[PDB]
Design a binder for this molecule. Structure first.
Ligand code: FUL
Ligand code: FUL
Lengths: 142, 142
């Protein structure tokens, strides 16, 4: 169905048991190194701090980080690449007690230990070289 | 006036005296490292070879390269950064006898010696984290 705006911004609250579900596809072939970025922000402003930064270079690598009082922290780099050239993906990001868990097409693929409480999140931004059909944050839990 | 599609693709021919003019703006603040990419391709297919690859990480750096029979060649990296945070830019790329010259807001900023004859170009693609208002290739010269 319908394409969502990219960059995509949604005001958001997160806590343990929250799930962020993203369905999209890369705009171009992996040879051209399309990117995907998901940022969990502390304010609606784009320049605000990032509790969780998740950046895919499709076909190549993923980096995760935080941006705290305007400054990037220690980068985690992964060469794990479950994403398939030319294919629609479903990303789900689960807020566990101790970490974010990133599922790609139902497969556990990345985790990132909380550096800031997930309750600090006020906004989620999904951007770079993708089309987006689905975005959901669950709000079912106390 | 009106926003052009991004990624932007135009069938193109280049030779000495050709100018490619691009007016656009970054989608987000430089702190979030928006990218710009301009690729001069040998075919309309996106996977085709790239005579001239020009990739800006806004606020940070520029890399130029070629992709020849599917394989990336020697990277040129520049820390020259005339692009201004939050501002509309005008990029012009001139085909000189021996190189591409990239003007940013009327200022000479990058050059890249021809590795393949500019006559090999069949397509220009402008993409990543920009909006586009103007794209022109000049066709005035023999
Ligand atoms: C400037 C920043 O450096 C950090 O270490 C990276 O994790 C971010 O992706 C960004 O490029
Ligand atoms: C895989 C490629 O490596 C080349 O050296 C770079 O110039 C391209 O931007 C791309 O990242």
């Amino acid at each position: 169905m319908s394409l969502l705006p990219v960059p995509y911004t949604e005001a958001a609250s997160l806590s343990t048991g929250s799930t962020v579900t993203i369905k999209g596809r890369p705009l171009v072939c992996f040879l051209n190194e399309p990117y995907l970025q998901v940022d969990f922000h502390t304010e609606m402003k784009e320049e605000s701090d990032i509790v969780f930064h998740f950046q895919v270079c499709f076909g190549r690598r993923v980096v995760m980080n935080s941006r705290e009082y305007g400054a990037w922290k220690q980068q985690v780099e992964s060469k794990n690449m479950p994403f398939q050239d030319g294919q629609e993906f479903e990303l789900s990001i689960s807020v566990l007690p101790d970490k974010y868990q990133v599922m790609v097409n139902g497969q556990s693929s990345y985790t990132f230990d909380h550096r800031i409480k997930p309750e600090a999140v006020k906004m989620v931004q999904v951007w770079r070289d993708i089309s987006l059909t689905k975005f959901n944050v669950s709000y079912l839990k106390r």
